[PDB]
Design an enzyme around this catalytic site. Structure first.
Site, PDB file in Angstrom:
ATOM      1  N   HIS A  22      49.859  47.210  36.289  1.00  0.00           N
ATOM      2  CA  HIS A  22      49.518  46.928  37.685  1.00  0.00           C
ATOM      3  C   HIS A  22      50.638  47.364  38.609  1.00  0.00           C
ATOM      4  O   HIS A  22      51.690  46.729  38.684  1.00  0.00           O
ATOM      5  CB  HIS A  22      49.204  45.435  37.837  1.00  0.00           C
ATOM      6  N   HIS A  29      40.970  50.039  34.218  1.00  0.00           N
ATOM      7  CA  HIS A  29      41.068  49.258  32.985  1.00  0.00           C
ATOM      8  C   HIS A  29      40.058  48.116  32.990  1.00  0.00           C
ATOM      9  O   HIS A  29      39.454  47.796  34.022  1.00  0.00           O
ATOM     10  CB  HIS A  29      42.477  48.689  32.787  1.00  0.00           C
ATOM     11  N   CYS A  64      40.177  34.791  36.469  1.00  0.00           N
ATOM     12  CA  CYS A  64      40.242  36.237  36.419  1.00  0.00           C
ATOM     13  C   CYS A  64      41.168  36.670  35.293  1.00  0.00           C
ATOM     14  O   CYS A  64      42.217  36.048  35.079  1.00  0.00           O
ATOM     15  CB  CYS A  64      40.754  36.745  37.775  1.00  0.00           C
ATOM     16  N   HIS A  66      42.235  39.690  31.724  1.00  0.00           N
ATOM     17  CA  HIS A  66      42.212  40.975  31.044  1.00  0.00           C
ATOM     18  C   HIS A  66      41.934  40.794  29.557  1.00  0.00           C
ATOM     19  O   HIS A  66      42.773  40.248  28.839  1.00  0.00           O
ATOM     20  CB  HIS A  66      43.553  41.688  31.249  1.00  0.00           C
ATOM     21  N   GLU A  84      45.034  29.279  31.827  1.00  0.00           N
ATOM     22  CA  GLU A  84      45.250  29.014  33.241  1.00  0.00           C
ATOM     23  C   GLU A  84      44.896  27.591  33.637  1.00  0.00           C
ATOM     24  O   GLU A  84      45.584  27.021  34.486  1.00  0.00           O
ATOM     25  CB  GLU A  84      44.395  29.980  34.087  1.00  0.00           C
ATOM     26  N   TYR A 101      35.474  47.467  40.752  1.00  0.00           N
ATOM     27  CA  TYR A 101      36.062  47.562  42.089  1.00  0.00           C
ATOM     28  C   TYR A 101      37.506  48.054  42.051  1.00  0.00           C
ATOM     29  O   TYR A 101      38.176  48.018  41.021  1.00  0.00           O
ATOM     30  CB  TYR A 101      36.021  46.194  42.797  1.00  0.00           C
ATOM     31  N   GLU A 111      44.540  46.759  42.181  1.00  0.00           N
ATOM     32  CA  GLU A 111      43.706  46.433  41.033  1.00  0.00           C
ATOM     33  C   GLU A 111      42.545  47.433  40.987  1.00  0.00           C
ATOM     34  O   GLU A 111      41.930  47.733  42.006  1.00  0.00           O
ATOM     35  CB  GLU A 111      43.152  45.009  41.037  1.00  0.00           C
ATOM     36  N   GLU A 113      39.298  48.108  38.446  1.00  0.00           N
ATOM     37  CA  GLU A 113      38.694  47.501  37.281  1.00  0.00           C
ATOM     38  C   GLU A 113      37.188  47.680  37.171  1.00  0.00           C
ATOM     39  O   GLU A 113      36.404  47.711  38.107  1.00  0.00           O
ATOM     40  CB  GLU A 113      39.013  45.982  37.263  1.00  0.00           C
ATOM     41  N   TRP A 158      37.800  40.379  45.620  1.00  0.00           N
ATOM     42  CA  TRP A 158      36.850  40.389  44.502  1.00  0.00           C
ATOM     43  C   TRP A 158      35.958  39.143  44.538  1.00  0.00           C
ATOM     44  O   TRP A 158      34.781  39.234  44.185  1.00  0.00           O
ATOM     45  CB  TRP A 158      37.509  40.487  43.135  1.00  0.00           C
TER      46      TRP A 158
HETATM   47  C1  LIG Z   1      40.770  39.876  38.380  1.00  0.00           C
HETATM   48  C2  LIG Z   1      39.732  40.892  38.902  1.00  0.00           C
HETATM   49  C3  LIG Z   1      41.910  39.765  39.403  1.00  0.00           C
HETATM   50  O1  LIG Z   1      42.606  41.001  39.541  1.00  0.00           O
HETATM   51  C4  LIG Z   1      41.311  40.385  37.022  1.00  0.00           C
HETATM   52  C5  LIG Z   1      42.807  40.039  36.921  1.00  0.00           C
HETATM   53  O2  LIG Z   1      43.045  38.647  37.108  1.00  0.00           O
HETATM   54  P1  LIG Z   1      44.520  38.266  37.026  1.00  0.00           P
HETATM   55  O3  LIG Z   1      44.432  36.763  37.044  1.00  0.00           O
HETATM   56  O4  LIG Z   1      45.266  38.738  38.042  1.00  0.00           O
HETATM   57  O5  LIG Z   1      44.999  38.668  35.632  1.00  0.00           O
HETATM   58  P2  LIG Z   1      45.760  37.837  34.601  1.00  0.00           P
HETATM   59  O6  LIG Z   1      47.055  37.677  34.909  1.00  0.00           O
HETATM   60  O7  LIG Z   1      45.597  38.446  33.222  1.00  0.00           O
HETATM   61  O8  LIG Z   1      45.136  36.482  34.478  1.00  0.00           O
HETATM   62 MG   LIG Z   2      44.178  35.325  35.853  1.00  0.00          MG
HETATM   63 MN   LIG Z   3      43.913  44.395  36.171  1.00  0.00          MN
END
Ligand SMILES: *[C@@](C)(CO)CCOP(=O)(O)OP(=O)(O)O
Ligand SMILES: [Mg+2]
Ligand SMILES: [Mn+2]
Ligand SMILES: *[C@@](C)(CO)CCOP(=O)(O)OP(=O)(O)O
Ligand SMILES: [Mg+2]
Ligand SMILES: [Mn+2]
Lengths: 180, 176
Positions: A22, A29, A64, A66, A84, A101, A111, A113, A158
């Site tokens: 990122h 991804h 949210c 990965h 989380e 998006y 981001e 994705e 998002w």
């Molecule tokens: C969502 C669309 C936000 O970008 C996917 C990523 O969520 P993040 O919470 O930012 O990622 P992680 O840190 O893996 O939890």
């Molecule tokens: Mg997250």
């Molecule tokens: Mn990501």
């Protein structure tokens, strides 16, 4: 942690370490997004921690994340809910399978994705992880959608895009039912 | 820069350095709050910098601050509009003179203030100070009130309380 890299047609080509993935130049991804409801049917909204690399301190939907190598998307949902939020859930339902998006955050982190969206019920108490989430609220979906309509700039983009998809929104509504 | 400590009769008793004043045990002091509109009557909503000690990263009304010893409330507004937003304004107008509150932020930092509220119009372009403001939006007051009404938690608690006061809201609304 890493991310799963995808080409233009959304086919996996390999993995990259998560932090390094990122940047201002984020390659496409895989990710997931999930909306969680309690037994009463209230929606859990959360506030990303100030230490998050992208959208720190922003209000957004429940969780949210990965998917990691070897992991199903639905298994990643379960994992991140535990990591989380400390929380157990019912099997995640697909609510917006083709969501995809790209967006730049207030400090220029991108981001980018393919991010299928799910909903599920919580079956345990929360145990918030302060490393990931700084605040949260149980509320009525209808009120969240009205807030999103009135002041969309106050939420993560998002969240807003997912909430504005007609069929996704119907599923969120379904989850507002009280359950025993 | 300091904050002014206040007793029960609202009389200054002394000062504390501003940063050192805001803790998990913040004591009562003087402040102001201000709502800014442009010539067209759009409301300016701002997002506090991630470096702010209290409510960092939070969406809130236009400008908030701490009057200094011997400073008028109107002069403090003008001073902070210049400092945080590099903007010139019309003479501040009273909107909610008796507002006072206490609240706790997500990391446990407290604000505990006697905080009269004002409105004004900008008379120049913003020039953002990113030590104070990380984002902002010009919008319609009607939409912001509906947002505050539907999802108050998306906004600072002091913004919510000011907006939900019956007279404050009338005067904000009458203002443009
Ligand atoms: C969502 C669309 C936000 O970008 C996917 C990523 O969520 P993040 O919470 O930012 O990622 P992680 O840190 O893996 O939890
Ligand atoms: Mg997250
Ligand atoms: Mn990501
Ligand atoms: C407002 C109501 C926040 O409690 C008064 C103080 O606002 P801050 O913006 O936090 O103060 P300053 O840092 O002096 O600008
Ligand atoms: Mg301020
Ligand atoms: Mn203060």
């Amino acid at each position: 942690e890493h991310v799963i890299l995808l080409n233009a047609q959304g086919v996996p080509t390999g993995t990259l370490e998560k932090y390094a993935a990122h940047t201002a130049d984020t390659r496409l991804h895989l990710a997931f997004s999930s909306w969680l409801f309690n037994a009463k049917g209230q929606l859990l909204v959360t506030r990303r921690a100030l230490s998050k690399k992208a959208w720190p301190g922003v209000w957004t939907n429940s969780v949210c994340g990965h998917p990691q190598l070897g992991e199903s998307n639905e298994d990643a949902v379960i994992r991140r809910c535990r990591y989380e939020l400390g929380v157990e859930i019912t099997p995640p339902e697909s609510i917006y399978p083709d969501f995809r998006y790209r967006a730049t955050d207030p400090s220029g982190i991108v981001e980018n994705e393919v991010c299928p969206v799910f909903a599920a019920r919580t079956t345990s108490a929360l145990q918030i992880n302060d490393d990931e989430v700084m605040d949260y609220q149980w509320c009525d979906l209808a009120d969240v959608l009205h807030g999103i309509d009135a002041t969309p700039w106050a939420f993560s983009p998002w969240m807003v895009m997912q909430a504005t998809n007609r069929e996704a929104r119907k599923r969120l509504s379904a989850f507002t039912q009280l359950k025993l």
